Amino acid sequence: QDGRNDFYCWVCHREGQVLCCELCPRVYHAKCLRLTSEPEGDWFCPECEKITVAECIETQS
Amino acid sequence: STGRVKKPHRY
Ligand SMILES: [Zn+2]
Ligand SMILES: [Zn+2]
C-alpha cells in the first residue's frame, strides 16, 4: 500500500537502497545519484530537479 | 519495508 518503493534502479537494474519518486519512475536509486540525504514524501531526484530548474527551455509565444 | 533505504533521520 506504500507503493512498494522496493523494485529496481535503472542504473544498476538491481534492487536495493532505492527511493520513491512521484514525478518519475515509482522507484529510483539514491546511491547511483550519490544522494547523502534521505527526504520523506514526494522527493525529486536530481534528474527531475535538474529539468525543473531549467523550466520551459523554449520560450512560449 | 525493513531498512530498504538509509533513514538516519537528518532532524
Ligand atoms: Zn543503482
Ligand atoms: Zn525524480
UniProtKB/TrEMBL annotation, chain A:
Instruction: Note the superkingdom of the native organism.
Output: Eukaryota
Record-annotated PHD-type domain positions:
6-51
Q: What is this protein called?
A: Zinc finger MYND-type containing 8
Q: Could you tell me which species this protein originates from?
A: Homo sapiens (Human)
Q: Which gene encodes it?
A: ZMYND8
Which section of the whole protein is represented?
58 to 118 of 175
